[PDB]
Design an enzyme around this catalytic site. Structure first.
Site, short mmCIF file in Angstrom:
data_model
loop_
_atom_site.label_atom_id
_atom_site.label_comp_id
_atom_site.label_asym_id
_atom_site.label_seq_id
_atom_site.Cartn_x
_atom_site.Cartn_y
_atom_site.Cartn_z
N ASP A 146 -4.60 21.96 -10.64
CA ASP A 146 -4.80 20.82 -11.53
C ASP A 146 -4.04 21.16 -12.80
O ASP A 146 -4.50 21.96 -13.62
CB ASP A 146 -6.28 20.55 -11.78
CG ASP A 146 -6.49 19.33 -12.65
OD1 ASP A 146 -5.61 19.02 -13.48
OD2 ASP A 146 -7.55 18.68 -12.51
N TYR A 176 -12.55 21.51 -13.31
CA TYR A 176 -13.15 20.26 -13.76
C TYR A 176 -14.42 19.96 -12.97
O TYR A 176 -14.44 20.03 -11.74
CB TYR A 176 -12.10 19.16 -13.60
CG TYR A 176 -12.49 17.80 -14.08
CD1 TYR A 176 -13.01 17.61 -15.35
CD2 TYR A 176 -12.32 16.69 -13.27
CE1 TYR A 176 -13.38 16.36 -15.79
CE2 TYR A 176 -12.68 15.43 -13.70
CZ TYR A 176 -13.20 15.27 -14.97
OH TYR A 176 -13.56 14.01 -15.39
N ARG A 218 0.83 -1.21 0.00
CA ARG A 218 0.00 0.00 0.00
C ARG A 218 0.86 1.26 0.00
O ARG A 218 0.42 2.32 -0.46
CB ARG A 218 -0.96 0.02 1.20
CG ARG A 218 -2.16 0.96 1.01
CD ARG A 218 -3.02 1.09 2.27
NE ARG A 218 -3.37 -0.21 2.82
CZ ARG A 218 -3.22 -0.56 4.09
NH1 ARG A 218 -2.86 0.31 5.01
NH2 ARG A 218 -3.46 -1.82 4.45
N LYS A 230 -4.12 11.21 -18.69
CA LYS A 230 -4.16 11.95 -19.94
C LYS A 230 -2.81 11.83 -20.64
O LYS A 230 -2.47 10.76 -21.15
CB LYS A 230 -4.55 13.41 -19.71
CG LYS A 230 -5.77 13.58 -18.81
CD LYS A 230 -6.97 12.77 -19.29
CE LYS A 230 -7.94 12.61 -18.13
NZ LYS A 230 -9.13 11.80 -18.50
#
Ligand SMILES: Cc1ncc(COP(=O)(O)O)c(CN[C@@H](C)C(=O)O)c1O
Ligand SMILES: Cc1ncc(COP(=O)(O)O)c(CN[C@@H](C)C(=O)O)c1O
Ligand SMILES: Cc1ncc(COP(=O)(O)O)c(CN[C@@H](C)C(=O)O)c1O
Ligand SMILES: Cc1ncc(COP(=O)(O)O)c(CN[C@@H](C)C(=O)O)c1O
Ligand SMILES: N[C@@H](CCCC[NH3+])C(=O)O
Ligand SMILES: N[C@@H](CCCC[NH3+])C(=O)O
Ligand SMILES: N[C@@H](CCCC[NH3+])C(=O)O
Ligand SMILES: N[C@@H](CCCC[NH3+])C(=O)O
Lengths: 393, 393, 392, 392
Positions: free
Chosen positions: B183, B109, B56, B208
């Site tokens: 962002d 966004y 993790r 992206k």
């Protein structure tokens, strides 16, 4: 069930997902292409109902796993997460708001406790604790603002089994609209049919037995119809998803889950029975072993056992003794996690356990050894444990 | 930078991660094995500092990507997430508490806005909005409880570029300890060196351009030294991680990011220049196109452009016109996401945009077409767009 | 007493695992040399587990190779894109113009076709033998016999060789012949071929080693005498497997014991039930008493897998074949085997006769090949019973 | 004008992509038939893109095969575990005892070794030709010449054939010979081999198609005349690639144009700079004026990739070789090429002479092979300049 193995082999396998192969296809995607405006409108309407819309909602590979998890655990929907800890944290978060109260067993997985005390507390959500054997007396801890009751059976490390029928019935008497949750990882979701007991949501670290090979991390949360839409949409608002390849590997792990669990049950109970007769063992915490805390509930409510249990040594090993013991095993490996083919060993000092048992008192003073019993020949594992005992006698 | 391509090829590649190959190894693991108690103690102490401890926290594959992201974006640490939306939501969540206020650009966004209005609001955290061109006047919106200032430049869909130097300087005058976030997905973290501008945390949907092929989802957040430990530990308490294979594929995407971005810049600016001369186009939103909102800031503060922009048609297309237009492209595909080799097309109705511009007013009434310009021959793409125009003339 | 422990641990050394339970996946063509001296050392050791070039392998391949050598008792393990490639290229590695190959007439059909359609035009002849020939194989060994190719149990019809008698007979006449076996049915671990004096044990790791019907790979484990020739001639044909499938083969090994025990238990039950059924003429299961070579299976194997066949009490018409095969609920119609899914295939007697060189078949009913997966056996029995009712 | 659009779209049909941009990854050995009639149809079409068995391919392979056929103008594309397997098995598919192979003496060394160490003992002879032989190859065609094997540019020394002159000469003497080319350097798209009358174009897709040094795979695209024989004889040797590497090859195609344009621009700059350097005797780059066959590259290719070599002005001693090669900051010493990383290798003249059958080398300095990756070219030049200073 007499058909569990057949169910495990076939769950989630529909032609639209497998396209001629035995296993689902692996569809890797963010972008999912709409051929027409009409197809995009249909995808948008059904973007949470198994129509291809956007990779964050899932591809064919995720849909196949979700169908499999809903069949096996008897739910309306299955949310997917990057790991078990994310499933716990985001499933709780999906149902609390400022001013709410969470009631959690004090044998819960330590990161689950820490999520409550370090994240929720600063957001206006409080957490109380209960002993795993509280049974019907949990009704006395429920508050007007209690929104979530969080179970974990068997408990982490110490393996205490809840009386789930007693707990659920008490909760439904006092706060019927409460969201009852369980971390059902130890049972792999199939040895304890949580939703059949009136629990609303069954959470798993699929990282453990579902993946089954110590090489993949993923969390799941299967919800009943009442709670599914809130879980799904709030978890999605947190961006929670798993990658397509790990989803494929989780579906794949399901196929052998029954054969594996039967061997983990057989081997671990044999080891526990031996430990329970051993002069250097003070206590054995195995739900399938007569005498263990909550055993009678395990016998009544579970359809089997897995391979994770623990035992208490006759003493609080020093650092030097702990190294002589743990450094020189030939088969058991020292590591976190469990549910794979490798046998694992992990030590916890009684005071370490006391520190993760809020508002409770530990009733042992020797070092606690947690074992995961893997797929090795059980006599070889016993010989390894015996050599360990001789190093510390 | 004149050495960006060299940096991209070499970032994160140290022998302990690559073990003789060019790319890092793929280490799939939950369990990470400690050979000795001493090794476990060392791993525990350094479990957030690149020593193998538990899946993790990461394996060698994650560490290699984290080192690469920190080099390229100039940060102290890089947190990894299952997708871009999870990176945004959990990076904000890591730094707010009940009673805090978030100030977010109203061109953010849409899922980032929805996280604020649907998740944070019910946890006692409020959200205000600002116009992307507010510049130094943002100082008037900062409140005594404002903890996070959230930027996105260029903005989603409409592509407005912030005056980041003006915004940062104003914020540091009024609330110097505020956490400024961006962002930075459109710039792929490398065309705008966010941390060099005084921003604390640079968030990306690596989904992206970093992945670059539309087939993998992952979020990243690179923090400066001041904010790293809070980001890292609070995101970990939410169980946030990415799988090893997607981490490998993100490192791999970095290697071609420069060549790809140069082609996306060249092709998309050519398309935008053509659209800006076109009788059926009302407006072109491309940061690299003279006249676009914030262009002067892009020219001053960015080292290049990517391939995502948008333009406004002369009319609000009906459903029937939108189908005639979008259903019959030969190269552009209708899909969400972007940053890959495939050119994509997506329509937004002016009223749809108005609905995701809180406390602001849209200044166009025609249908907004967002284009991702991929790696196809630009003349073929222009011919495809021209055929589209003829279908709606 | 120890196979399960060996399966869990095989091939796992820190240089390959680097902290995880499983080996790392090292995807690579290029492998980097830090110095000229490092390059010279890698070159010297390019077939001995030093990183040199991806065609020789990465750490992931080395780990699987070590595991296979430990489990099958060999000196080296060559890797191939699939089982058929392992068979074809392992035979090819040991023959040249003028040589003769002696192959069981129960060999997998693509193995036979490799011999008749590829080897023959390259000047290598192939002769055939009945799988129960035992010591009488000595009479078929020619001065130019180079390879004796075994497959036990046989493909489809499941005949078990008397390997000790065959090997002793071969070694008497041609002590240095290359004896090979396609050991896929035993997954290389239910029959320890190299301990019986066979030189090379070949597997379609596609079957039980992968264990999930979703990866293809061939292996060939050779003794010390034959390894270098196998290794170098397979390498000259470019034979390798990708690192990810190598990883998935090592991973499959770990559950092979618990899977095989279920396949054994379930397929033996089904076989015993079919043997009592009035619509069944004969059951071909190595573990079932009365099956061809059963006595050798019981003596020489440590268990059974889940693949076997049976002959129906009649020849099905085309209409009956469709009624039977098109309407199973659990059994799937597909090629391959060794996974969790139960599978079914049919062959008419003349179809088998066509792939039994220089032999005739001794049955006239339709032959059904079953792979018994991990489903509940009573559900599989109900599926088979429903099929019987559709053709009664 | 259209290659970039073709690369982005090749092989992408809804039956393979099912909603995503890239093809699905279908991992499978077993492929399920729902009915007997479906099984019959799959069997009839098992080499024509109907799901039949994983050794023939899944949807992922079919998508890549369609892409390669579209891009290279072929009737079918066979897939292999690596480039060397593609070369070996494509030649093997077309020869038999008594045949003769005519191969350029600049062929990749493992290709030569396949001929001399495998084919020869199977009754197939190999003769050699200078890569600039052009029309005079007609004088080397024997009555039993079956295969003419080209490689343009040549391995390491980069000589470019006059393919139109060679092909015309072959067709005059032996119209039905099988003309093959190892077209890896051009990535199958900078030289459209089948348009020149070559029958089969072979690639190590390992190089530029994968493009990242982390996957191995071979391809062979054949015209209509040769496809069925290639397909079926490669299948009889079990040749395939795993579905995941097939997916990664399709994925590599999508950026091949933008990558190759950078490799061309950068490697031509480096070549032009080396050609002016006082410590360089000669530069072997197909795109550089004066290089062997340059005129044919300019006429017949649509661009260059990034692999080339040069000869130093002296023979380096062992100490100088270590000083040179051990201390580069960016160039890595490794085999293979076609990725984002720049690579370097050295060969002495006698090493090249040993792999130039029936020829002598025409240089005496140490030869350096460079792969020019995607780094900033000025940084690569500085790295090379520092190397020159270490041996001056
Ligand atoms: C009961 C339980 N729930 C949740 C988790 C968290 O799942 P992930 O590790 O996939 O996030 C674990 C893992 N606990 C391991 C680490 C242990 O007990 O060693 C667990 O045991
Ligand atoms: C600017 C920006 N930030 C975050 C995200 C979320 O990343 P993930 O999709 O990996 O969660 C996106 C994706 N927006 C896509 C879907 C679009 O604009 O179509 C984005 O464009
Ligand atoms: C005994 C045997 N050997 C080799 C192979 C070839 O392995 P690959 O399929 O990986 O090339 C098979 C496959 N037989 C499958 C197809 C069956 O019997 O249906 C086999 O059964
Ligand atoms: C021209 C050429 N053909 C075929 C191959 C073989 O491909 P595989 O490595 O995928 O089998 C290579 C590899 N040559 C590398 C090793 C080099 O020149 O260093 C090659 O350069
Ligand atoms: N029809 C299902 C498989 C049925 C499996 C029966 N065991 C599919 O297409 O995936
Ligand atoms: N030494 C680094 C690679 C250096 C790369 C130079 N281009 C590693 O081991 O991964
Ligand atoms: N030391 C071995 C693991 C031993 C496994 C014990 N069960 C390794 O590093 O991979
Ligand atoms: N229709 C194709 C995609 C067309 C791509 C256009 N650029 C498919 O389903 O895969």
């Amino acid at each position: 069930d007499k058909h569990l193995d057949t169910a495990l082999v076939n769950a989630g396998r529909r032609k639209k997902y497998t396209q001629g192969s035995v296993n689902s296809v692996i569809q890797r995607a963010s972008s999912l292409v709409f051929d027409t405006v009409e197809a995009k409108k249909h995808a948008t309407r059904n973007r949470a109902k198994g129509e291809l819309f956007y990779g964050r909602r899932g591809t064919l590979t995720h849909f196949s796993l979700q169908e499999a998890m809903c069949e096996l655990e008897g739910g309306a929907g299955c949310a997917l997460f990057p790991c078990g800890a994310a499933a716990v944290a985001n499933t709780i978060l999906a149902f609390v708001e400022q001013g709410d109260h969470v009631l959690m067993t004090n044998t819960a997985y330590e990161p689950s406790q820490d999520f409550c005390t370090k994240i929720l507390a600063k957001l206006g959500v409080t957490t109380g604790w209960f002993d795993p054997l509280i049974g019907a007396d949990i009704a006395n801890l429920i508050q007007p603002n209690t929104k979530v009751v969080f179970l974990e059976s068997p408990g982490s490390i110490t393996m205490e089994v809840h009386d789930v029928p007693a707990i659920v019935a008490a909760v439904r008497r006092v706060a019927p609209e409460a969201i009852i949750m369980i971390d059902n990882t130890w049972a792999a979701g199939v040895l304890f049919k949580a939703l059949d007991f009136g629990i609303d949501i069954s959470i798993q670290a699929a990282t453990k037995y579902l993946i089954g090979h110590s090489d993949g991390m993923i969390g799941t949360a299967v919800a009943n119809a009442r709670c599914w839409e809130q879980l799904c949409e709030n978890a999605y608002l947190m961006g929670q998803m798993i990658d397509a390849d790990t989803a494929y590997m989780t579906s794949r792990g399901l196929r052998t889950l029954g054969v594996r669990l039967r061997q983990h049950h057989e081997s671990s109970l044999r080891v526990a029975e031996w430990l329970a007769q051993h002069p250097q063992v003070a206590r054995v915490n195995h739900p399938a072993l007569p005498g263990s805390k909550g055993h009678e509930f395990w016998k009544r409510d579970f359809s089997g056992s897995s391979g994770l249990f623990s035992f208490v040594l006759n003493k609080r090993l020093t650092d030097a003794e702990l190294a002589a013991y743990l450094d020189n095993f030939s088969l058991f490996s020292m590591a976190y996690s469990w549910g794979g083919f490798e046998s694992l060993i992990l030590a916890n000092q009684p005071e370490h356990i006391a520190a993760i048992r809020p508002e409770a008192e530990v009733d042992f003073s020797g070092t606690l050894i947690r074992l995961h019993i893997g797929l090795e020949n059980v006599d070889d594992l016993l010989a390894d444990l015996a050599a360990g005992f001789a190093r510390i006698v």
